[PDB]
Amino acid sequence: LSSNFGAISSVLNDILSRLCKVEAEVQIDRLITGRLQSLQTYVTQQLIR
Amino acid sequence: GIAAEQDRNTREVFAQVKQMYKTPTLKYFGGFNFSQILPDPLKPTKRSFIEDLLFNKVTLADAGFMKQYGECLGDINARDLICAQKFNGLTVLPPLLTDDMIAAYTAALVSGTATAGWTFGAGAALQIPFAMQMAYRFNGIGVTQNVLYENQKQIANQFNKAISQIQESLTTTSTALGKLQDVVNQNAQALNTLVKQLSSNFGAISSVLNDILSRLCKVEAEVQIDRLITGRLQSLQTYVTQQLIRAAEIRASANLAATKMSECVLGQSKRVDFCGKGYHLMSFPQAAPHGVVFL
Amino acid sequence: LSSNFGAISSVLNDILSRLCKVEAEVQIDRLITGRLQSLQTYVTQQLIRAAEIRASANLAATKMSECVLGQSKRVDFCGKGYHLMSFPQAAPHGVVFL
Amino acid sequence: TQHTSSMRGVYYPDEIFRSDTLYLTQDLFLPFYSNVTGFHTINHTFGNPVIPFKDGIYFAATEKSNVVRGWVFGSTMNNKSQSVIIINNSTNVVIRACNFELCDNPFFATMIFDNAFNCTFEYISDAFFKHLREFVFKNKDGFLYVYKGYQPIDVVRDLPSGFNTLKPIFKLPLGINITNFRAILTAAAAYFVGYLKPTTFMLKYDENGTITDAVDCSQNPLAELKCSVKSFEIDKGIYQTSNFRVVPSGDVVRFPNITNLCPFGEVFNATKFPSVYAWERKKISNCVADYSVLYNSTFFSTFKCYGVCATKLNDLCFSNVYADSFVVKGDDVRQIAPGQTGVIADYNYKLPDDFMGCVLAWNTRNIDATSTGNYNYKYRYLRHGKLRPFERDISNVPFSPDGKPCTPPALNCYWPLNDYGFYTTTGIGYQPYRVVVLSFELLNAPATVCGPKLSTDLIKNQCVNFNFNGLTGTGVLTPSSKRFQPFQQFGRDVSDFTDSVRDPKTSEILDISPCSFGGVSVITPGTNASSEVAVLYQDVNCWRIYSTGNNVFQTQAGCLIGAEHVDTSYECDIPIGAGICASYHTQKSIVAYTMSLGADSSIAYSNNTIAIPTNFSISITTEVMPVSMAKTSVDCNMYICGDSTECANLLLQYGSFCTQLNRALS
Amino acid sequence: TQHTSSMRGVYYPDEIFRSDTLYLTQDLFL
Amino acid sequence: LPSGFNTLKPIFKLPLGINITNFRAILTAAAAYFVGYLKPTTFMLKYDENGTITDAVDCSQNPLAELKCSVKSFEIDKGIYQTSNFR
Amino acid sequence: ADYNYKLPDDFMGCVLAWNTRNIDATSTGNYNYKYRYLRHGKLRPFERDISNVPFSPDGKPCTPPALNCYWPLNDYGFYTTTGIGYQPYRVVVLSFEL
Amino acid sequence: KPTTFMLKYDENGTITDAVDCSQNPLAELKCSVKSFEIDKGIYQTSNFR
Amino acid sequence: DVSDFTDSVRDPKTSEILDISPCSFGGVSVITPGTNASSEVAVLYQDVN
Numbered sequence A: 001l002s003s004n005f006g007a008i009s010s011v012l013n014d015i016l017s018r019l020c021k022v023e024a025e026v027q028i029d030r031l032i033t034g035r036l037q038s039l040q041t042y043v044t045q046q047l048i049r
Numbered sequence B: 001g002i003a004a005e006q007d008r009n010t011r012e013v014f015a016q017v018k019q020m021y022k023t024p025t026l027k028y029f030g031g032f033n034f035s036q037i038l039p040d041p042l043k044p045t046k047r048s049f050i051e052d053l054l055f056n057k058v059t060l061a062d063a064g065f066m067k068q069y070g071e072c073l074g075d076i077n078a079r080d081l082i083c084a085q086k087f088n089g090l091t092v093l094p095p096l097l098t099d100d101m102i103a104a105y106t107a108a109l110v111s112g113t114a115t116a117g118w119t120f121g122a123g124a125a126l127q128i129p130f131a132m133q134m135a136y137r138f139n140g141i142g143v144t145q146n147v148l149y150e151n152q153k154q155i156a157n158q159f160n161k162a163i164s165q166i167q168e169s170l171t172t173t174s175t176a177l178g179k180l181q182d183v184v185n186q187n188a189q190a191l192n193t194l195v196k197q198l199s200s201n202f203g204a205i206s207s208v209l210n211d212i213l214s215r216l217c218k219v220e221a222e223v224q225i226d227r228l229i230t231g232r233l234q235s236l237q238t239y240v241t242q243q244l245i246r247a248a249e250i251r252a253s254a255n256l257a258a259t260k261m262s263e264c265v266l267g268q269s270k271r272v273d274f275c276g277k278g279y280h281l282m283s284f285p286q287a288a289p290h291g292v293v294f295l
Numbered sequence C: 001l002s003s004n005f006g007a008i009s010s011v012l013n014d015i016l017s018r019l020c021k022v023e024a025e026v027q028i029d030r031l032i033t034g035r036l037q038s039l040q041t042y043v044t045q046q047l048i049r050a051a052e053i054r055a056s057a058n059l060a061a062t063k064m065s066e067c068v069l070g071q072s073k074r075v076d077f078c079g080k081g082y083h084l085m086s087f088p089q090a091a092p093h094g095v096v097f098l
Numbered sequence D: 001t002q003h004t005s006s007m008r009g010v011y012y013p014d015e016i017f018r019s020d021t022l023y024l025t026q027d028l029f030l031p032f033y034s035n036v037t038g039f040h041t042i043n044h045t046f047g048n049p050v051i052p053f054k055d056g057i058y059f060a061a062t063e064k065s066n067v068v069r070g071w072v073f074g075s076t077m078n079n080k081s082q083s084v085i086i087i088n089n090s091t092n093v094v095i096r097a098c099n100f101e102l103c104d105n106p107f108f109a110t111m112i113f114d115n116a117f118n119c120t121f122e123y124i125s126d127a128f129f130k131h132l133r134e135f136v137f138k139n140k141d142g143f144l145y146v147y148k149g150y151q152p153i154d155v156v157r158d159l160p161s162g163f164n165t166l167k168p169i170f171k172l173p174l175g176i177n178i179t180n181f182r183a184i185l186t187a188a189a190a191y192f193v194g195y196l197k198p199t200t201f202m203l204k205y206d207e208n209g210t211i212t213d214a215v216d217c218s219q220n221p222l223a224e225l226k227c228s229v230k231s232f233e234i235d236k237g238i239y240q241t242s243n244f245r246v247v248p249s250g251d252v253v254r255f256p257n258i259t260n261l262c263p264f265g266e267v268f269n270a271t272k273f274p275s276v277y278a279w280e281r282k283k284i285s286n287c288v289a290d291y292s293v294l295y296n297s298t299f300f301s302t303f304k305c306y307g308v309c310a311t312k313l314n315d316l317c318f319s320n321v322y323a324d325s326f327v328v329k330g331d332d333v334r335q336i337a338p339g340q341t342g343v344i345a346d347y348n349y350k351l352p353d354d355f356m357g358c359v360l361a362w363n364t365r366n367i368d369a370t371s372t373g374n375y376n377y378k379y380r381y382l383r384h385g386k387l388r389p390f391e392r393d394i395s396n397v398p399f400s401p402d403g404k405p406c407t408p409p410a411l412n413c414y415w416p417l418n419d420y421g422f423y424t425t426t427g428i429g430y431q432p433y434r435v436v437v438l439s440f441e442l443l444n445a446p447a448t449v450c451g452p453k454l455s456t457d458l459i460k461n462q463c464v465n466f467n468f469n470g471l472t473g474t475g476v477l478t479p480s481s482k483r484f485q486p487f488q489q490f491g492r493d494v495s496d497f498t499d500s501v502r503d504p505k506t507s508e509i510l511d512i513s514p515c516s517f518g519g520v521s522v523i524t525p526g527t528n529a530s531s532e533v534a535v536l537y538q539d540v541n542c543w544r545i546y547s548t549g550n551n552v553f554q555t556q557a558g559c560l561i562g563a564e565h566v567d568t569s570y571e572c573d574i575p576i577g578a579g580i581c582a583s584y585h586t587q588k589s590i591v592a593y594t595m596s597l598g599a600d601s602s603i604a605y606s607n608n609t610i611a612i613p614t615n616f617s618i619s620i621t622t623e624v625m626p627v628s629m630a631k632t633s634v635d636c637n638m639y640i641c642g643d644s645t646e647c648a649n650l651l652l653q654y655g656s657f658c659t660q661l662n663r664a665l666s
Numbered sequence E: 001t002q003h004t005s006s007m008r009g010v011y012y013p014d015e016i017f018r019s020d021t022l023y024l025t026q027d028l029f030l
Numbered sequence F: 001l002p003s004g005f006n007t008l009k010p011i012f013k014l015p016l017g018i019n020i021t022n023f024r025a026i027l028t029a030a031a032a033y034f035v036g037y038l039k040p041t042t043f044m045l046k047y048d049e050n051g052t053i054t055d056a057v058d059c060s061q062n063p064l065a066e067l068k069c070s071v072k073s074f075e076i077d078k079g080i081y082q083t084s085n086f087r
Numbered sequence G: 001a002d003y004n005y006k007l008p009d010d011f012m013g014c015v016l017a018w019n020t021r022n023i024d025a026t027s028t029g030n031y032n033y034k035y036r037y038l039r040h041g042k043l044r045p046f047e048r049d050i051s052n053v054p055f056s057p058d059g060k061p062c063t064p065p066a067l068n069c070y071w072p073l074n075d076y077g078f079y080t081t082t083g084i085g086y087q088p089y090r091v092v093v094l095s096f097e098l
Numbered sequence H: 001k002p003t004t005f006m007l008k009y010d011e012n013g014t015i016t017d018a019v020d021c022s023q024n025p026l027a028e029l030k031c032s033v034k035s036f037e038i039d040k041g042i043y044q045t046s047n048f049r
Numbered sequence I: 001d002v003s004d005f006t007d008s009v010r011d012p013k014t015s016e017i018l019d020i021s022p023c024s025f026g027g028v029s030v031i032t033p034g035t036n037a038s039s040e041v042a043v044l045y046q047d048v049n
């Protein structure tokens, strides 16, 4: 959960405190897609086990 | 690969015998009533009375596998799920073996059991009257054959009564065939989830390519289209992975059904609780939607 | 490995020779995520194939135990007919029972 | 007359060496077995009309005595536009792009032009049926590309069949409108013309890096399958290809019927603009906004749009149009933008972060600036908080930093408005500028301010391209039974696909459907056996088929075309489905039949007879089973970032994913 | 005095026709 | 105030640009009026075949409504469901 | 950008411009520079239009001393004393491949 | 030199040990698994560079 | 290549053709006992004689 997935930071508070709304909305989606991918990988491994 | 395996499962379960025995005209073999598990030449259907109930218990989605274009443009007010799936590139292919073919296979198996016994799996069928076959089955579980030959009326009556109870149990609405309904429910839910997941914008301006191409400018539109492309590709990949795992589960079940048909319909088994609760005497197969029912 | 995954090019040398550092760092991450996704897909397919191979190997082990080391009463578990004997032979990635 | 281009006219797509690969590309190509037009010298008749140039041509000349000498490319072809002449005058190859008076009968033995002026491009080369000379001409981004190829032939009448790859020789920077062309002959020969289309090809390279074979992916379903699997060889079986598609035929444009030109003069040319603290808003409605009437008189120093590319502003229609007007100084024009700070953006006029519209500003030193000094424009510089977007503050109340009311002749009490002092002799950062901000919405609501695009008649029950108020697409339009409310214009699915529209001229509701529908399977034997295939279409009753061929008949699986139905039943090797199977049997052909379940047998039940075996046989049966597969390992660092330090540094924070992959493989 | 708003005061969130769907939205509601 | 469900339609979108913090009603010189306050909330709305809103689910009312908004359905089968964690 | 000189969307190159008020502007007024303001369509990228033909909105040929018939080229009027938005600038566009 | 290190922190927030990831293949393995302890066995490390 | 890797070049001074190859090649495995026993390891290199 500490990967930034090619964004400014891995902390949503840092992005929302400093960046500006349209620019922050394109950095939040990278973290959203990365964390969704992590959950999907966990679920697939669990199904095989 | 998944679809080819689905054809192979049915072939490995139902097509074990090589020659198709005809249904005998007489259904009454020494006290035992085989009329409810064999086809009769008077009804329009090609299948037995119990298989009719089994196909009535399970509701299907695709009646046929043919939805014409004029039919989907004739049904727009009724938001049909199949038209929505087909307009987005998702299709369902017919099985190779028709239900009539599977019914013919099960009829051949039941006729061979009732006339030849256990010998048509090892090789050529050997005829034997049904009372003697019952005597050998009784002798196989450690009971002498005079017990059969002196109580034949009672055993025949109990067999007929048990068949009637099986018939009465399947006419009342219940969840006996509930793990065959789960398969079709899971398939329908997966396809509908693919259809509904197509409205996510995946962090873009819109989820509609027409809106992006009508308003945005070419280099800026080419970076918004790739987000939708990657999102929809990810959705298809997730669907394919779930389908592969479900196919593995179905293949394990079909392997168990094939070995159970081999060791319990074509012979008598010594394995405890492998075919019913008690000392195994016989088994009969019946076809069901996407599956098999052993009695 | 020749997909650009929505970037300028699929070659890192072309991006680093021409684009500028902050702009190159947002084009390299697309290639990184795409290639990581490709490796993950390969690993998932390999795990599923390994499960199928393991089921086959378990069946081969129990067949060697119950048909080469003894005589089986199970119908059609080892050949068509009444089982008398079995002999194993090695094969590339597998076993052949006679 | 009419001939066919049998695998004719392939060229090198780029300047990159490739060997022993299959390359898939999409470009302007001559499609396989397409129509070509022949021009022959039957008699003294000089056959050379003006042939139209439709985004590139393939030209072939079959020659024995060098009759065709060059070409003229142009648009008007008289004296009014630029034209380019490419000829060989038996000593040089000369290319000349000028503005010259053409002749009705241009020929050699040099009569091509009466006179020439305003010459733009010049190129002179170096000094210097049996022949076939092939050319590809294409125009793109002000460049004329020429590709050339040569072949010795012996044919006397027709264009010979074969395959030959053309190489680039010229890339001329002309910048010329090319719509028409004409060949130049000498005073016994033939030439052939074909047209290029946007197409996907798959090309094969040798070990010498030469193109020797290609596959046109849109010729027939077998070629679609070949391009899908990226191989020239297909094994025996049945393959699910792409679904059945039709191409759009017509165009439909439906816009609201508006007559009035939209009031540019009343907005941009007004005698009086307000101050920035008291900015004014005006609604714009029922007008045609083409803005090309401003190219004669009015010019803007800044013009910036947000939410839409400017080049599409003539193809759209706008829903809720408002215009804000005010006056600032030159140094404050940069503050009229989203996400900005300063006195104007904080206390006078603020734009939203998700703003959609345009900002226009122009210098007005000759109207709002006097030599004495214009002091009629004001701005607020003191406030107790920032403004919200599109919020106005009008009050003139004395300001105190602590926050309590005060009397202006006192201490720590100020007047919150300052004057702009506009002089003629000041620098440009202190000169007045007039600013207009336009705000609107796009493609989600009823609209009444549109562009100058012309409308078109409606077409029903046919795959067309459509444009409703700027929303474009491809589909089939049918009358609908939905009941829109007066504030609604569009309708959407559960998957956010626009499926209903209200026609803006006659207020009827229309349903939109996709054009492609229905699964298609291709049944083939091995590629070694034949190039013939059979096609099975689900969802059609035997229409919506690619070709009718021979032997079309209905099965339980679908409509089968290209196979013959036989009454006898066998085992099957190609499973079609629903009990139907196919095979390749005898002249060989593809046959379809019902599969056989097994052998017929009869044993009779008796209550007193038994059957006993008398003899036996010993049998040995083989059974093969897999046990293991190949053990494999990957290295993320080399696969993702091969010998690059910067990529490895960027990858350094993805290490958990790679250790997870390595654990799975081990 | 004090009363309760029992499923009171729902409005149309946009100007787009929808039929036979369930739509999830986030806005200022009672 | 009677109970029930009734959907409201847009009639006005006025471009005022005014700081609005207070309001007051105007009466004639026997009647009642009721005031409630809006909150930022997630709803789930149901449409008819005529395109009319006839039912809704407020996703923050109780855990059953949270479950309904999570599964996107108005009907829940018998069983036990893991909802969102306690906030 | 519509009638005189258009750049491609995927342009690669550089644009340079500088003020030239001391060379191309006179006190009397330099009227030797022209631009087109009337056309029946937009230009394609890197396309040139040279013709000087009378323009009619309906689209038919006409004689310039008539009604609804214009000359399609306007003069730039470059003076020394004007503001900087009306001063001449020299522009060079470089295009290449990499 | 430009180098990748792995540092260990105490419960007092003090650095008391480190691993230089480019010293020898054992240190490469330690930095790959992110641990100071390796169990007995054979491990596929990075390819030869 | 087939993977879009630049593998050949023409030298711009003398018009000869040159092949470009990567520098890293060959798998490496590390055999270790437990970290408690020793810090000594054995290294197995495939693809070298």
Ligand SMILES: C=CC1=C(C)/C(=C/c2[nH]c(/C=C3N=C(/C=C4\NC(=O)C(C)=C4C=C)C(C)=C\3CCC(=O)O)c(CCC(=O)O)c2C)NC1=O
Binding pocket: D066, D067, D068, D069, D070, D071, D086, D087, D088, D093, D133, D148, D169
């Ligand atoms: C029309 C423009 C035109 C172009 C672009 C052109 C290009 C061209 N002409 C060539 C040779 C040649 N080209 C021709 C003749 C012709 N080839 C033609 O396309 C035509 C129309 C003629 C008729 C005059 C001949 C006779 C040779 C020399 C063949 C030889 O060397 O044996 C070559 C090969 C050069 C080489 O030998 O290495 C090229 C690339 N020739 C042209 O005439």
Ligand SMILES: CCCCC/C=C\C/C=C\CCCCCCCC(=O)O
Binding pocket: D262, D263, D264, D267, D268, D284, D289, D291, D294, D299, D300, D303, D313, D318, D321, D323, D358, D438, D440, D449
């Ligand atoms: C005055 C009412 C205008 C209403 C138009 C509403 C929407 C149309 C959107 C943009 C129109 C731009 C007009 C100015 C273009 C200037 C072009 C230029 O020279 O750079």
Ligand SMILES: CCCCC/C=C\C/C=C\CCCCCCCC(=O)O
Binding pocket: D341, D342, D343
């Ligand atoms: C002189 C010491 C300044 C130190 C301030 C340090 C950090 C604060 C960051 C930015 C302050 C910007 C000050 C100028 C703002 C001008 C606003 C305008 O009119 O456009």
Ligand SMILES: *[C@@H]1O[C@H](CO)[C@@H](O)[C@H](O)[C@H]1NC(C)=O
Binding pocket: B028, B033, B035, B036
């Ligand atoms: C049992 O057999 C008799 C024939 O004697 C038949 O009439 C009867 O229908 C059979 N039972 C059932 C339930 O069909």
Ligand SMILES: *[C@@H]1O[C@H](CO)[C@@H](O)[C@H](O)[C@H]1NC(C)=O
Binding pocket: D002, D035
């Ligand atoms: C090509 O010419 C044939 C006549 O031989 C004609 O039938 C066909 O329609 C033409 N092709 C196209 C695309 O029009």
Ligand SMILES: *[C@@H]1O[C@H](CO)[C@@H](O)[C@H](O)[C@H]1NC(C)=O
Binding pocket: D075, D076, D177, D179, G041, G042, G043, G044
């Ligand atoms: C010049 O090209 C334009 C499109 O760029 C076209 O509309 C016009 O008709 C062409 N000129 C002639 C004379 O055909």
Ligand SMILES: *[C@@H]1O[C@H](CO)[C@@H](O)[C@H](O)[C@H]1NC(C)=O
Binding pocket: D078, D079, D101
């Ligand atoms: C262009 O050609 C035409 C041909 O009729 C001629 O009348 C006209 O004068 C020519 N223009 C020039 C500038 O020479």
Ligand SMILES: *[C@@H]1O[C@H](CO)[C@@H](O)[C@H](O)[C@H]1NC(C)=O
Binding pocket: D089, D090, D091, D092, D094, D124
């Ligand atoms: C061909 O054209 C060139 C171009 O000017 C000229 O120099 C040459 O003399 C011409 N050849 C003949 C035979 O006229």
Ligand SMILES: *[C@@H]1O[C@H](CO)[C@@H](O)[C@H](O)[C@H]1NC(C)=O
Binding pocket: D117, D118, G050
């Ligand atoms: C084209 O030629 C005419 C004379 O016929 C001339 O007046 C005009 O300036 C020329 N155009 C260009 C762009 O040189």
Ligand SMILES: *[C@@H]1O[C@H](CO)[C@@H](O)[C@H](O)[C@H]1NC(C)=O
Binding pocket: D206, D207, D208
């Ligand atoms: C490749 O080039 C060599 C050398 O000219 C030639 O001998 C060989 O035939 C070529 N390959 C093919 C497939 O033609």
Ligand SMILES: *[C@@H]1O[C@H](CO)[C@@H](O)[C@H](O)[C@H]1NC(C)=O
Binding pocket: D296, G070
């Ligand atoms: C452009 O302006 C000039 C000068 O006022 C005028 O003569 C000309 O007719 C105008 N053009 C149009 C098309 O109105």
Ligand SMILES: *[C@@H]1O[C@H](CO)[C@@H](O)[C@H](O)[C@H]1NC(C)=O
Binding pocket: D269, D297, D298
């Ligand atoms: C603006 O209006 C004034 C008076 O109405 C007029 O003199 C002036 O020419 C107009 N300017 C433009 C650019 O139309």
Ligand SMILES: *[C@@H]1O[C@H](CO)[C@@H](O)[C@H](O)[C@H]1NC(C)=O
Binding pocket: D257, D504, D505, D506, D507
């Ligand atoms: C113009 O629009 C009105 C409003 O929809 C419509 O009634 C009328 O038919 C339209 N005019 C024509 C000529 O169709």
Ligand SMILES: *[C@@H]1O[C@H](CO)[C@@H](O)[C@H](O)[C@H]1NC(C)=O
Binding pocket: B066, D541, D542
């Ligand atoms: C196809 O059409 C014929 C007559 O048009 C009809 O008899 C037949 O049932 C149809 N096939 C199907 C599968 O509906």
Ligand SMILES: *[C@@H]1O[C@H](CO)[C@@H](O)[C@H](O)[C@H]1NC(C)=O
Binding pocket: D615, D616
């Ligand atoms: C049948 O048995 C006899 C003796 O038991 C033997 O000679 C004969 O070979 C057997 N039949 C066959 C076909 O082998």
Ligand SMILES: *[C@@H]1O[C@H](CO)[C@@H](O)[C@H](O)[C@H]1NC(C)=O
Binding pocket: F048, F049, F050
């Ligand atoms: C939809 O509209 C029709 C026509 O007014 C009406 O009869 C029907 O009752 C409506 N549907 C519902 C669910 O009220």
